[PDB]
Each structure stands twice: as structure tokens, then as C-alpha cells.
Amino acid sequence: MRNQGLGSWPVRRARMSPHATAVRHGGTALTYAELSRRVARLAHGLREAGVRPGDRVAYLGPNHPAYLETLFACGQAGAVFVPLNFRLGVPELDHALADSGASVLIHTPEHAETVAALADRLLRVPAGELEAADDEPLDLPVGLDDVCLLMYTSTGRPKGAMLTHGNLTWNCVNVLVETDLASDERALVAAPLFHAAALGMVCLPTLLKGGTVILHSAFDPGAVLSAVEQERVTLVFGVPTMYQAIAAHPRWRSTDLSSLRTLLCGGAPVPADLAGRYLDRGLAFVQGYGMTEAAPGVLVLDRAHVAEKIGSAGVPSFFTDVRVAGPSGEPVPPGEKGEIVVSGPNVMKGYWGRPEATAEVLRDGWFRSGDVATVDGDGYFHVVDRLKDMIISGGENIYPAEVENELYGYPEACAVIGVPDPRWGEVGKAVVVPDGAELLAWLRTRLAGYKVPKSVEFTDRLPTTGSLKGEVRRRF
Amino acid sequence: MRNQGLGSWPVRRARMSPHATAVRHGGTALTYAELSRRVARLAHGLREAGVRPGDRVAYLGPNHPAYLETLFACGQAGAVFVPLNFRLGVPELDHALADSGASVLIHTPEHAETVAALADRLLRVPAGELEAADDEPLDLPVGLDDVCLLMYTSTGRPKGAMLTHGNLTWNCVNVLVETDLASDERALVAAPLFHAAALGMVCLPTLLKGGTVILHSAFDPGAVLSAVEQERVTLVFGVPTMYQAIAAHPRWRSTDLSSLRTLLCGGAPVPADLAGRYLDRGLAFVQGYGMTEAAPGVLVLDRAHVAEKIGSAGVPSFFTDVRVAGPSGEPVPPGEKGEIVVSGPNVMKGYWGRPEATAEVLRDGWFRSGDVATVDGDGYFHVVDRLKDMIISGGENIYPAEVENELYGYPEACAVIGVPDPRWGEVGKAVVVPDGAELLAWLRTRLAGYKVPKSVEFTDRLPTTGSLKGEVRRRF
Amino acid sequence: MRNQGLGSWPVRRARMSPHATAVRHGGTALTYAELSRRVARLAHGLREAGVRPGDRVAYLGPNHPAYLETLFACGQAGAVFVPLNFRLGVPELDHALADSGASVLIHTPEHAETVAALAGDRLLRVPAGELEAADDEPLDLPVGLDDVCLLMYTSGRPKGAMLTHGNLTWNCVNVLVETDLASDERALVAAPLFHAAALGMVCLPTLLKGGTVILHSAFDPGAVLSAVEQERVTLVFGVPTMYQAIAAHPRWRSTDLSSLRTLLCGGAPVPADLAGRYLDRGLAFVQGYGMTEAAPGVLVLDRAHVAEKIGSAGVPSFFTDVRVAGPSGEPVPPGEKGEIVVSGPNVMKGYWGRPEATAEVLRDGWFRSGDVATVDGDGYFHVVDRLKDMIISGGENIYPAEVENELYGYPGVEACAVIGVPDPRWGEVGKAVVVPAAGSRIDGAELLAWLRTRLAGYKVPKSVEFTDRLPTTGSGKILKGEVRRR
Amino acid sequence: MRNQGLGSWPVRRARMSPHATAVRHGGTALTYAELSRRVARLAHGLREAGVRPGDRVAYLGPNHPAYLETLFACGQAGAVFVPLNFRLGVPELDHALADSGASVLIHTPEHAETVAALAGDRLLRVPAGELEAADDEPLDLPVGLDDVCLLMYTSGRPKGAMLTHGNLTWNCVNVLVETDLASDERALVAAPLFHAAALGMVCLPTLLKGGTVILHSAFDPGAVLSAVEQERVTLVFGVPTMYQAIAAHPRWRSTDLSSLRTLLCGGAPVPADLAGRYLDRGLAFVQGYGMTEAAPGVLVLDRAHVAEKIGSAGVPSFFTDVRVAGPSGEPVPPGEKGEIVVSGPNVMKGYWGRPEATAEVLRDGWFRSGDVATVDGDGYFHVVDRLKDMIISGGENIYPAEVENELYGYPGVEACAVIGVPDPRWGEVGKAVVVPAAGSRIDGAELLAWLRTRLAGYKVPKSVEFTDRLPTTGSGKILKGEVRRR
Ligand SMILES: Nc1ncnc2c1ncn2[C@@H]1O[C@H](COP(=O)(O)O)[C@@H](O)[C@H]1O
Ligand SMILES: Nc1ncnc2c1ncn2[C@@H]1O[C@H](COP(=O)(O)O)[C@@H](O)[C@H]1O
Ligand SMILES: Nc1ncnc2c1ncn2[C@@H]1O[C@H](COP(=O)(O)O)[C@@H](O)[C@H]1O
Ligand SMILES: Nc1ncnc2c1ncn2[C@@H]1O[C@H](COP(=O)(O)O)[C@@H](O)[C@H]1O
Ligand SMILES: [Mg+2]
Ligand SMILES: [Mg+2]
Ligand SMILES: [Mg+2]
Ligand SMILES: [Mg+2]
Ligand SMILES: [Mg+2]
Ligand SMILES: [Mg+2]
Ligand SMILES: [Mg+2]
Ligand SMILES: [Mg+2]
């Protein structure tokens, strides 16, 4: 078989479990054989619409069978898939389509308006039209080092992370090594497949294991609770906010959750209170740390250590290597702070048409996360902060997230930011929404003096749309 | 991490589950951390004994922790491991050591006599001596295309199958894709680790998943039954003969088997009667077809189809491609006979220092199994016979195994062999152990005339040590 | 340097010989310094026009600096170059553009009309020299030797040969190993650069060596002779028909040829007449055999061995392996006929979008030439015919070239071609198509009767049809897609 | 052909120029045909003696056909060649054999005693020419360009540079691109083949081009001159000390040097005296800079640019990238000092069994030269000193070569060396070690007092110790492991 990439997956799965159900969405159920044939038809269709090896095909739409069909079809046509972030403005879609140089944009009816407003040598086709009339799979030569997809990463305009067929395959291998999945898996995907997390951590590994991927086009806590008991979901991925919204809904206590085997949380660390609430209900989080550039898995905190290592990001996935390094590039003394750097077959080729930006951050197979961390005696990592947020005050490092985290012990939302100073170069400045007074004096009971902000401004709201933004700087 | 091969596995597993038990043998229990440190010490030890990248280290001994320690140590030293078949004569050991050019032979006390009789620029050291006094892992550069081990294949002298770190890694990925293993796996290894089957199908995948490998230096049906209930085994690999011996032992009915989740059978097809007996007891066989040259997995018949497709070899493992091909090299019309040929990342680099012999059988990534087969409408394969046993009679193919299989319906053991003929070029000759008469007339009720042997010789015993041999030819 | 491909060549060469003349075209000369600045301006320009890694850029025009600028600019932009046969009509160009999926076409002004008529909605049509951006700093995109450099179309429908950066780099290494080029070469490219021959055998190796490529937009033997003595050409590539026209020109005696060091001849063998005419003016041919799919070098017959091994295609280039194989695939009894099969780092990735057609001719890195040949005890290859021109008649093979060779011995046969035609008795039978000399009269029955004299009856065509002209390539090979016409 | 490595070179070359002389050594000449038969006999012989893929075979002896036979036979047997420094004592050879893990040692008869004293239990000791098997059919084992061809030991303890088949192949491509070699080269190898210079810059490229390698077992300027005029040498490699001894010989005027086309000089820059002495006999040096770990080519200063860019190490070879980097790793303000870092397919796999020492100097395919240098506006490199010879004195850098350069200007300083010596005030301070001319008397205090005249006080050594001779390499570089002696 000449196609070694994701394009071949539907065909390989169909030889193994043709009649097993692969995708559920509204009333739509696709078996593996139905997926293979629908993929082979869209591939031949992209060929006929003039798609050639290395060409980019964008998808603008929600979690939906068309997402996976476009993904596998691209692979089958030797093309590069581009899953757009469906929440972005026209200017931003335009930027993503210009940069990737997409030659075809496949979209769902609800985006038809927005698609018609996009900047003219792009073939914009509604999902289902482009599909052709052969349903025998193409077998084009695709190696694992060939780019499978461009995933745009939000300090500059967005950059396309080049994830190879190899990157996503080896990420799925990592998941199968560290988590226990089976043939009879029923995985609920209510996080977006346009993020590496839903796609890499749950969708692809469930399809590869011959289980069922249940897609929701939207996140609703209630639909997720109903889905869990009605569909007998074994496997869910979410970010803390999605598990917060689920636990907080009226039917949290009423819903039957005995079917859940594996609850994956990524994106950010699970707050202690949230982990405790799921634990109280018999549910333990597997916590993942990762990034787009690692396709995305890097560290796993297993359900056994979730309580024993509170707000650890965990240990390396099997085929990855992870270290904390200085600016010096060398490993730091254990317990000391440095930058998480990642290496392995899951790590990206680079940023699409940005080779210099790539070289700042990728070198000798090692990717710079932009995360400050410590490694404890047991090789468990502890994320401190974003290296970009770091304040330098009389040559001493201040991690806002440490100072912020103390401010939250005070009787809503806060940001600590760097501010020029005539003699220290930079000094802390707390921005707080509440009912006030100068209790920086409380912070002086809690922090190294030099870490305490020298000023505190009260406000009414902060740019907290992130679901906080360092545009707080702009309001110094 | 520069070592991408099996040598790195103990270190990667120890970052993940240090305190979980990896190996049980007599009273010996090794945790992953204990395995990593023991491996790092044997690696440094091999270095100090003058082992350099690409050097061969042989192991002569039974299933035992020293087997895995030598395997991982070789990998860690950038060396090539050579697991000898412990049942072979001195002349045959000599041939395997000459051909591989082993520079170190590590052995267990019981083989000390035999090792002292071996032909003088070989360093012969008992297991445990060579071990050194650093226990920090070496990180030498090892790629997946580097040879991990030489596995000798029984029509000529034995040939060393070069299995790369890549071959064994991708075989383990295949196993994790098609079978459901967990962190809490307890796998019994009473088949020899010097075969690709025990090593590739069970041992490596169980270690990679963070479970426990229970080794028995010998096959005893009784010890296996006791082991299953006393140790709570979830996972067993065997050949039909080993499952035949287990089911036939006094304590078959008495033994508690509720712990068994996955029963793997390989080597040959499970006789209907044997599959039925395990089924009657609630136990379903996953059947594997494979060969040394595929590291070794190729086809899987899952527990769901074990009854529905009796004596099918099954469908391709996910990352493999399998076809029946003519001498013409092309796929054959469905249902027609041809040679199973295998392709994929599990398939060997070639036979050690035999490039011409390799080229007869490996070409464009495709390996010739030497197995005649058919593929049915559902893509399920059916092994007919060994291409080498095929008889050509007036230009028509006779598969002895088909004729033999009819002879076994007659009221012990039989072989059908080719025999020169003045006008047909070759003709059948049945060799039977019983009480006789010429009931080739019964075969004429059952077979195409041209397939019926033209003569039948009765005998007392046949070379049935294989646990039949085409040395029956020699007694034409 | 992250770009290992041809896109990095102008920057690697500008570091060593910045002020040496790289390209001469009439009154225009680029130094290596200027080539690198122009290539980098065009690569930036292409990217501004939406060119991204793997996109296809086509060039329509003759031998021109813009050919080499577009080639190198594509590599620098991580893109794939598509050199179009500039003699094609718009239906054939439409096919090449659609199959390739070119999203940009650069053309010289004489193709403005052809370009206006192309099937194009998502093709940017650009006149050469209108996409030169302000930024002249070389881009350094990650490009490996296994990345595709260009699609070169075959003469079924045209198939796009995927030549990698490695394929073309290793062809140049083959040329440097077997031919003696120096930093003062003055190479005349009067054959088309859209063929592998001029590009791979003369153009790129000369640029690699810091030499001067002299381009002619067209072949005129009179321009070639003026150029050799005026420009002191050291190196020429041509097919035998070019070298014939050069020798049959009135200024062949008066032209100073003393500068000529290396005469490369490919496409077909040099007739004994041709060798003799050049021998007597001191000039010997290095004869090469190759194909598009080997980028293109495979065999060479050097000037030292043209004497004893007459009509040989010669011996393998250093990094290339060459064999004659059975219809099986297995090597043949030495002396007997089989197919030339080629292996090495010069051999293509496969045909673009045509994986099944690729697998029929490319397995285990061995390419099926479609050439029938023998190999002698000395490893010298002898090309007999094209496999697909074979005529099977009562289950015996007939080699038409053996028959055409005999037909040339008959008074007033100026050109001919023997094709397979269906027949119920024999499956196939030969038909001769013969072009008579303008001042010669030929009886069909006498011609056939005379062949029967010379050949086993099974080889002799059953019929003869006369014509004024046969379908010949720009070079002068008979298409044999005159099966269609008779 | 499954062997892509140097092991296949004798068979690839026997196909093209079988009867051309490949190697001449006094009265012995091998044709390419005979080299291939001998290499194949030895490869079979090695395998009979238990040599398998990846095993190490060492050669102890001078420049000799057996060097090249063992090299190519190792490749053909899938094995790794270990060319030992034949000037080493048995403790240093024992180290090289133990670190390499050689399981076979081929030696010429003059090393019979040294070889008898080696620490060996599992080493087969073999006299050259005693492992020639009957089978002369080339083996074709699978060998990739990334397989290790040879371990070349560094001058800590010696480190084994893993040079791949690719590394050495791509060095030869670099040589063919930048130097004008032809099939009639007659290359004199009077420098040792156990160094990368003679092997990679002259020997292998000449064999690739179907030329003749003329080997001398020893360097004697009188033999070199006789050989040039008698053998009509076209190509020579040497370090400046070899070219100095050749020019200071009585038969330099009477020797016909007219055959010389290419003079390659590596190791160190040619003094202005040397260039002038060769200029006046019509001869110009192609000057190369390189190291073992780049197989070894990196920079070249061609004869066309030796005039204006005096003391330059020149510009990068075509397939090699070269930069000056901060202690950071980042490129430096142009004109300022940093370390030469090298990238390209010629750069080694790493040091054998020494992955940590490798990672200190080799990341992202960039190798740290240990050379301090500047680059000018023209991309020409200027080597200043070795990084590890730097003297840090009150946190200021002192370049000893800048100080030794000034010391050479003082009456009767024949040789000298400046080393770092510990000091409590400044961390480090310089000490001069000076060899006086046999007929010169020098006051230490006056020498230092005069340096103070010429240099900032912080650069001037605090002490001077006199000696009769300094530790110099076979070439003539000062070891600087005279730190040990003073
Ligand atoms: N489990 C986690 N714990 C803490 N921070 C995390 C975790 N997962 C992701 N992050 C943060 O989010 C980044 C990933 O960004 P993205 O590629 O957009 O998913 C990481 O580099 C961290 O800064
Ligand atoms: N499941 C199976 N069914 C039938 N034959 C098998 C099966 N597994 C292995 N074999 C046979 O045994 C061979 C493997 O030999 P070995 O490499 O020694 O294990 C295959 O090529 C088949 O001939
Ligand atoms: N020297 C030659 N002698 C005979 N045929 C040749 C020679 N050079 C090229 N050819 C033919 O031209 C074909 C390549 O065509 P093309 O790829 O279009 O250049 C070869 O496969 C041969 O059939
Ligand atoms: N042309 C040259 N000019 C200056 N130093 C050189 C030159 N060629 C070689 N070297 C020095 O020799 C080193 C290589 O030593 P080796 O690897 O033992 O040949 C380089 O790193 C330089 O320090
Ligand atoms: Mg950039
Ligand atoms: Mg053989
Ligand atoms: Mg000029
Ligand atoms: Mg096709
Ligand atoms: Mg033409
Ligand atoms: Mg000679
Ligand atoms: Mg070390
Ligand atoms: Mg020396």
C-alpha cells in the first residue's frame, strides 16, 4: 500500500471491522465501510475539481462527519487538510486561506454567507457537492514525513503548524500506549476537531481502535449529560471549563454515568475543586499537557496520581522526550525553573512558510513550548507560567501566575503585568476587578518582596473572552 | 533522546510506571525501575567487555529475566541481539554463532557444558557476570531502521532475519491496534521468546502497555493451569499443541479461568475441535497468522469471527498490506490460489549476509511467505499449503495438504509427496501409518481425479518430531 | 542551509564565483551574483502571488534566462517547476496545465495569444519579468533531495515524470564523474531546455562548475557555427539531426571549431557517416543514452571506445545500475534480448497522479525503459527497438528497426516505418510506410520481393503504402503514432 | 546495485575505464579492472575470516595499494574501515583498537613487531595479501549513504569520527564542483591517507574521475620532484611545510614542473614567501580549510582570489554551509569574532561511542570547528585561533596566535608558542615558550619589554621559557599539549 498516511486509514479499518459503527451525528451513523466508500468518493471528487499532491483543502464547519471525510479524502488525494477555526471573523479566515494557499474551501450550509464574503482563485463548494462517482480508494504514494494538515496557532499573526501523517500517527500510538481503549469504545467529541486535542487525543485513536466517535456540532452540558446515558459513552475529552459546565448543570446528580471508563482533560490544569467533584462521583480525570506543535500529546498525569500530584502536568508520553532547559539550552538542576522543550516523532515539521520563526523555536528535533516549569524528584513536571509573561525586576524573574495565584486567595479576577521603572527596569502592577484598599501588605506576608507588585489598579471588567489576555498590557 | 529503539524502552517505561511490576519468574519480581537499572548496568558491562555499535551479542537460555535484560542492553549498547534456539545441537549453535559473528555469548548455568564445547574469538560469559557498576542509561544514536536482532529461520542452512527496532515497534503498534490490552495486563509467556511470536505478540506489547510478563522456563500444562488461577493471568500466547495439552490435563475442569481476558493462538490454525472445547468453557481464541520475516504479525482472525470463518487465517493487521499474487506478481482473481505476500513497517530489512536469497523473496517492500492461499469475498485469507510442497502433474497443481486432509477422514498420520512419472512429470504417493488395502477408491469419491495419489505405502512411524517433515521425500 | 534543492544553487554559486558570467543570451549576460538576486526577487514575487510549498509554476517560452530564473525561483519558494513543450497547441497545453495543476504560468511575449486561449479560471497568467519583488534576500525554505523539483511530460496521454531535487543533482554528479568540465566551460544550449537532455546533461552541470551557458532560443546550424568561433564554445549538446544540419552547412569548412573540447550527442546513435565527418575536423562525440525518467543520464559511449563498439549505447554512468531483464524481471542469458531496466538516485519518484501506470514500470527502484537491447561480454549495451513497437506474428517477435534498417538499403527509400497491423492468421503482420526520394520511382511488390531476399519471410511486411512525409519529432524520431494514420 | 557505498566504487569504475591505471606504487600498477578483482577477493576473504556487516577492520601501514584495497573491501563486506596513524606507539594503537573494537588488523611487514606487542585476544592479526579468497565476483550487500564507512581518530583521548559513505561521497562531489579534475589526472599522494586530506581531497576524487593515484609511502621532497617530471604529475596535495621542503631542495630549478595543473594546499595558510616562490615558477595554490569531521572539505581559496584575500581561508564548498556563531549559537555582527560552524552532507554522523561529546559539538547537523574566525563583507573567512587555546585574563580574551605572530618579528625567534597558565589576580596569564635560532642569543626581559611596545599589556605573556625544540605534528603544527611540559 503506497499511501502510508491518514488517507489510508478508512481502507485499513474497513478490512478489519467493516460493519462496526465509526461515526454518530444526529441520525447519521457511518460504519467503517460506509466511511471508506464516502472518503474514496470525495478523494476522486477533489482530483476531478483539480486537487493534486501537496494542494491545500480547507474545511469551514463544526464537528460533523464532513470534517473526517474531508480529512481522510485530502490524505487519499495526497493533499494537505486545513481545518479552519469556525469562530473567526472574515479578515481572519482570509488570512488563514491566503497563508495556507487553500485551492478548495469545503463548508457547511450555516457558513454559506461568510464563505461568499471571502477574498477569488479559491473553489468554495458546500459539503456533499464535490463528492464524485468512483468509490474505489486511490492509493497515491504518501510517506509519514508528508504534511497531513496545517493547524493555525493563535504575539504575531497565526502560523500554520505542519503536522505530518507521522506526527498524528505517533501521537495516536502515544495515546494507545498510556491509555486503555478497546474495540467497543464510544467516544463523545464536543470539543472542536479543529484543535489538535479532540482530533489527536480522542477522535483518531478511537477510529484506529475500531470504536465509535459521537460528534456534537456544539457544546451543551445538557446534551453531553443526555448523550452519556442515552449513548452509553465510555470516553470523553474536554477542557476544565467543559467539565465545570457539565458538573454545574441541574441533571449532574440525576444522570447515569456508569458507562464512562476514561475522562480525558487537557488545555489547562484541572482546578483541585473540579477534580474533587468528579472524584466524589466516582470519576477520575486523566490530565494531558500538550500543544499544537506536538500533535499534541507531551505529558500525561494518570488517574492513579491525579490526587497525589495536584496540578502536576505529569510525565512524558512513551515515544516523546521532555526536559526543562535554560536559555543555555542545557537541562537545569532538578527543582530549578526552565523552559519545557519537547522532542519526538509527534513533533511538527515546522510553521508553513515561516522557516526563521521555526528556527527560533525548533532545533535538533527540540521544540520550545514557551512554558516555564520545574521537574520534581519523581520526574513530574509543574507548569509555572508562560515565558512571554515573565517580569524582570532588578535582574530577578517574576512569574505573574504565581503572584496572581496569591491575589485569588484575597476576598474575582486579576492580572499582574510588567511596567517600566527608572532603576529596576521593570516592576509588578496588579490589575484587579472586585471592596479595595492597599493590601499589597497581604501579598508581602505571602511572597518574596521583589515579587510583590509596587502598584494596584482596580477596574470593572478585564479582557476575559479567552474562555485572561495579555492585552491588559495595552491598559498598563 | 537519541536511542529511538528497544534499548530506550526500559528508561521510557520507568518514567511512566516505575513501581509497577514488569517481570515475574520463580520468586524474582522486577519493577520497571529495577528493569531500567539492571539494563543500564548490562549495557555499560557490554561496553566494558568491548561491545561497540553493530556488534552481535547471543543469548543461550530459556524464557528468563536475563533474555529481556540482554535484549534491552544490546539495544542500549547499539548492538544486535541474537536469541539462540536452546534446543539445537553444538554443530547448529556453532553455525548460528559463525553466521551472526556473535562477539559475546551470554548463557544460563544449565547450558555451561554446551557453551564450553562451542568452536574461540567468542567471549562466553554466564548471565550476571558481565553486568557492570554504572546504572545510568546510555543514550547512543539508534534509528528505527537499525537492526535490533537476528532471528534464525529453520531447504538450506538457517538464515538470520534482520528485524529492525522499527519492525518490532510497528508489530507492537499492530497488536495494540487489533487487540485490547491494559495497564493491568498479566501475560503468561510459556512459548519461547527466541520465537518472534511470544516476543512480538505478547512480551513486548505487555511491557509497552505497563503490565506484567510472567515467564516459565518450560511448558508444563499443569504449571500453566496453576499459574492462571494463582497469578490471575489475563493474557496467554500458545500454538495449538500448547492449548491441546492444557485442555487435556486432569485440572482443565477444576482450574479457575475467570481471570483470562485474551487467549492468543498462532503458529498454525486451531483445529475446530480445540476451538469448540475452549468455546464450551467460555474461552475464545484470537488467531494470528505470521512469520519471522514480519516481526511477526500479518493476519488476525478476531474472537467474533473464530466460529463464523473456521480455519481462516484472518484479515490484515492495520499497518500491514497482504495480497495473494501469481508467479506473475499481480493480484489473482478473488477465490483463485496464489502466494501470500506481505508489505509494511513490520517487514524485515533482509537475511543477514544473504542478499541474493533476500532478493528471491523480498522486493519493493513485498515479502513472499511461501504460503499458497485464497482470499474470499470478505477479504478473509485461507491458507492451503506450503508452495514448496506443491506437486505438478500433467501441468496441474496438487496441494498435498488438501489430499492429506481427505486421507485423515479415513479410519492416524499421513504425508502425500511428489514422485517422478515418465509421462506426467510428477504423480502423488500417499505415505500412511495405521488396517490397509487400496482405498485410493475412497479418495476418488472425494477429489478431482488428477489430485488422487497413484500409489500408497504403509509404514510404522513418520518423521513427526516437528511438534510432519518433507524428509518423507528422502523415503520416496 | 535548509534548502538542499536546486532553489539554493544560485546562492551556493554566488558565494564562490559571484562575478563569473553564468548565462549569456544575445546581448544579455547574468553573472552568478545577478542570477541569485534575480531568482530571489522572483521567489519573493511568486510567494506574494500566493505560491506556497508544493504548488506548481509552469514556464511557456524558448531557451531564455527566464527558464532558469523560474526553475531556481520555484525551488527557492518550495514549489514545483513545469517546463511546457512550447511547440504544443492550446488543447495539449490545457492538458499539461490541468494534469500538473499549475496555479501560475510565466510566458515570453510571443505566447501572449496561445496563453489568452488556455482553459484557465484559477491560473495566474504572468509575462516573464512582471513578478520581480523588491526583497532580493534568498529565501531558505526546508527542501529535501526527495522533494519534487519538476514535472517533465512524456511525448497514452502525456505522463508527468516527477524529477526530485536529488534526481537532477545526482544526474549532474554522473555528468561531472564521466565528462571533463572545468570552470571556464562555454556550453551552447541550442536544444530545448524543456527536455532533460539540454537541462541535465549540459545546462545544470555547467552552472554547477561556474561555467557560462550560452542559450539559443531556436536551432539554426548557421547560428551554431557563428557562435562556436565567435563565443569560443567548449561544450555542445545535440541529437544526430542537429549535428547533421551543422555539418551539411556551407560555413563548416571556414568555421574555426578549435575551441570545441566536448561534443555530447544523445537521443539516437551517430551514423558512421556523421562520426567520420567530425573525425576529419578533429571532433569526436561523447554519445549518451537516457530517458526523461532517469533525469536523464543512463549510459555513455566515450570518444575512446566509439571505434570498436560502433552502434553501442555504451556503459552505465557511475551512480546508475543498468541491466537487461526478461518479461519475468530476471536477468537474461548474456547476448539475448530483454528490456533495459535502470536504478540509481537519478531515477524519478514516479508519474504525477498516475500510481498504477508508475507501478507497471517502477518497482524496487528499477525503471522499465521500454527499450529492447542486448549486453555483450564487455558490459556494452546495444539498443535494438522499443518493446511496444514489437510485432508478434504467429507468436514470433519482429523488431521493426531490423526491417527498417534493411529497407534503407533499397534505392530511393528516404525514410520508412514498419508498424503492426491486425491479421486473423498471425495475430499481427507488418506494414511498411515508405517516403520515396522526390526523384525516385519504387514498385511496392519489388520492394517486398527484395526484403524476402534479405530476411526470413515471417519478418517481411505483407503490404507497402507510400507517403510524402512521416510524423517526426522536433529532433527527428518517427512518432509511430502513424499506427493512427495507417 | 544494493551497495551505494565506497565498497561499490571499484565495480562502478571497472564498468567505465577497466584498462586505465587506477593506482601506481613504485613498480606496481593496478588498472580499475584489477582493483575491483582484488577488492572482491579481499571482501570474500574478510567474510571467510568472520567479518560481518558493521564489524571494524583496521589497516596499519603507509600509503600502499593495501590501504585502498582494505578500504574498498570493507565497504564491499558491509564493514567499517579503521585507518590507524602508523607513527603511534603500541599504547596509542591499543587505545584505537579497543575504542574502535576492530576484530581484524591488516598490516604491512615493517609493523610485524609493533603488531606482535598489541593488546589482542579477539583481534585477528593479518599481513597484507594473506586474505585474498578465490571468488572475485563482487559482493552486493545492502549499504546506504548513512552507513558508517570509516572511523578517523582525532589527534582528551582520541575520538573516532564516524564518516559515512555519504560524507566521503559528498566531499568528492564538493571537490569535483570546485576543482577541475579530468580522466587523465596523475595525482601524487605523498601525504598520509590515514588523514582525511589526502584521502578525501585527492585520492577518492581522482579514482572517481578514472585518474591515476601515484602513492609515496613517505614524504621526501627529492622523490616528489623526480616523480613530478618523470610521472608528469598533474595534481598534488600537501600542507605548507611539504611545499616549503620541496622549494628549499636543490633540484627545484632543474625539475620540469610544466605537467602540474592543480596544487592543493590544506592544514594551514601558505606564507606570502611560499606563494611568491611558486608564483615565479608559474604555480598557484588552491588553498583549502577543513577538518576530519567534515570528511574534510569546508572552505576553498582558489588561485583567482589568493591575491586580494591574503591570509583568508576562502569561501564555502558548494554543498556545505559555513557560519561564524556566538558562544550562544546565533550568527555574529559581521567583522566580529566567533566559532566556525559547518553543515552539509559531508559533516560526520558523530564520534564513535561518544554521544555526549558529540552533542556538545554537533546539533541540528551543525558542527563546532573549535576555530575562532571572522567573515568579511565578501563572505571570505579569516581563521584567528583555536577556541580552546584562548587565554581569559581579567575576563578579557587573548588570542595566542596574535601574540606568536608578533614574537616572530623579533630577532632569532625560530619557533614559539603562547599558553595559558593559572594566575590568582587574572585567572589566566600568558607564558611564551621560544625556540632560539642556534646562532642567536635572546634576553627574556627584552623580548617581553618589546612585546609591550607592540601590544596592549593585557595580551603580553608574564614569563618566557626557552627550549631547543617544540612538540610539532608530522605536518608541523605545534601540539600545544606543551601545556603539559610548561
Ligand atoms: N495540562 C496543561 N496544564 C497546563 N497548561 C497547559 C496544559 N495543556 C496545555 N497548556 C497550555 O496551553 C498551551 C497549548 O496551547 P495550544 O497549542 O493552543 O493548545 C501549552 O503550551 C500550555 O501553555
Ligand atoms: N495462523 C496460521 N495458520 C496457518 N499457517 C500458519 C499460521 N501461522 C503460521 N503459519 C505457518 O507457519 C509459517 C511461519 O513460520 P515461522 O516464521 O517459523 O513462525 C507461516 O508462513 C505458515 O506457513
Ligand atoms: N543514444 C541513444 N540510442 C538509442 N536510443 C536512444 C538514445 N538516447 C535516447 N534514445 C531513445 O529515446 C528514449 C528516451 O526518450 P525521451 O525520454 O523522450 O528523451 C530512450 O528510451 C530510447 O528509446
Ligand atoms: N587552511 C587552513 N587554515 C587554517 N587552519 C587550518 C586550515 N586547514 C586546517 N586548519 C586547522 O586544522 C583543523 C583541522 O584539523 P584536522 O581535523 O586534524 O585536520 C582546523 O579546524 C583548523 O584549525
Ligand atoms: Mg519567517
Ligand atoms: Mg547469498
Ligand atoms: Mg561572457
Ligand atoms: Mg493511474
Ligand atoms: Mg518535440
Ligand atoms: Mg601509469
Ligand atoms: Mg561520552
Ligand atoms: Mg601526526
PDB file of N, CA, C and O in Angstrom, chain A residues 275-286:
ATOM      1  N   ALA A 275     -11.636  18.485  40.199  1.00  0.00           N
ATOM      2  CA  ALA A 275     -11.112  17.097  40.278  1.00  0.00           C
ATOM      3  C   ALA A 275     -11.809  16.371  41.423  1.00  0.00           C
ATOM      4  O   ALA A 275     -12.207  15.212  41.233  1.00  0.00           O
ATOM      5  N   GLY A 276     -11.937  17.060  42.559  1.00  0.00           N
ATOM      6  CA  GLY A 276     -12.599  16.563  43.781  1.00  0.00           C
ATOM      7  C   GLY A 276     -14.051  16.217  43.537  1.00  0.00           C
ATOM      8  O   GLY A 276     -14.464  15.140  43.969  1.00  0.00           O
ATOM      9  N   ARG A 277     -14.777  17.080  42.830  1.00  0.00           N
ATOM     10  CA  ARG A 277     -16.223  16.906  42.490  1.00  0.00           C
ATOM     11  C   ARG A 277     -16.427  15.673  41.592  1.00  0.00           C
ATOM     12  O   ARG A 277     -17.410  14.933  41.801  1.00  0.00           O
ATOM     13  N   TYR A 278     -15.550  15.440  40.616  1.00  0.00           N
ATOM     14  CA  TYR A 278     -15.670  14.268  39.708  1.00  0.00           C
ATOM     15  C   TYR A 278     -15.274  13.022  40.504  1.00  0.00           C
ATOM     16  O   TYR A 278     -15.912  11.971  40.311  1.00  0.00           O
ATOM     17  N   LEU A 279     -14.247  13.140  41.356  1.00  0.00           N
ATOM     18  CA  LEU A 279     -13.771  12.054  42.260  1.00  0.00           C
ATOM     19  C   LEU A 279     -14.914  11.647  43.196  1.00  0.00           C
ATOM     20  O   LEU A 279     -15.134  10.445  43.371  1.00  0.00           O
ATOM     21  N   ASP A 280     -15.614  12.625  43.773  1.00  0.00           N
ATOM     22  CA  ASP A 280     -16.739  12.378  44.714  1.00  0.00           C
ATOM     23  C   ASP A 280     -17.779  11.520  43.991  1.00  0.00           C
ATOM     24  O   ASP A 280     -18.421  10.695  44.662  1.00  0.00           O
ATOM     25  N   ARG A 281     -17.916  11.686  42.670  1.00  0.00           N
ATOM     26  CA  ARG A 281     -18.954  10.992  41.858  1.00  0.00           C
ATOM     27  C   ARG A 281     -18.388   9.694  41.247  1.00  0.00           C
ATOM     28  O   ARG A 281     -19.110   9.053  40.475  1.00  0.00           O
ATOM     29  N   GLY A 282     -17.168   9.282  41.611  1.00  0.00           N
ATOM     30  CA  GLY A 282     -16.547   8.031  41.128  1.00  0.00           C
ATOM     31  C   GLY A 282     -15.760   8.235  39.834  1.00  0.00           C
ATOM     32  O   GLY A 282     -15.341   7.223  39.243  1.00  0.00           O
ATOM     33  N   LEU A 283     -15.522   9.486  39.413  1.00  0.00           N
ATOM     34  CA  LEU A 283     -14.924   9.797  38.079  1.00  0.00           C
ATOM     35  C   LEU A 283     -13.544  10.440  38.254  1.00  0.00           C
ATOM     36  O   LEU A 283     -13.435  11.458  38.958  1.00  0.00           O
ATOM     37  N   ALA A 284     -12.518   9.821  37.674  1.00  0.00           N
ATOM     38  CA  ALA A 284     -11.116  10.277  37.760  1.00  0.00           C
ATOM     39  C   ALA A 284     -10.685  10.771  36.381  1.00  0.00           C
ATOM     40  O   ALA A 284     -10.879  10.030  35.379  1.00  0.00           O
ATOM     41  N   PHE A 285     -10.105  11.967  36.363  1.00  0.00           N
ATOM     42  CA  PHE A 285      -9.525  12.625  35.172  1.00  0.00           C
ATOM     43  C   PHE A 285      -8.128  12.071  34.888  1.00  0.00           C
ATOM     44  O   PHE A 285      -7.261  12.088  35.778  1.00  0.00           O
ATOM     45  N   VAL A 286      -7.927  11.600  33.660  1.00  0.00           N
ATOM     46  CA  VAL A 286      -6.590  11.560  33.007  1.00  0.00           C
ATOM     47  C   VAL A 286      -6.322  12.968  32.472  1.00  0.00           C
ATOM     48  O   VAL A 286      -7.133  13.452  31.690  1.00  0.00           O
TER      49      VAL A 286
END
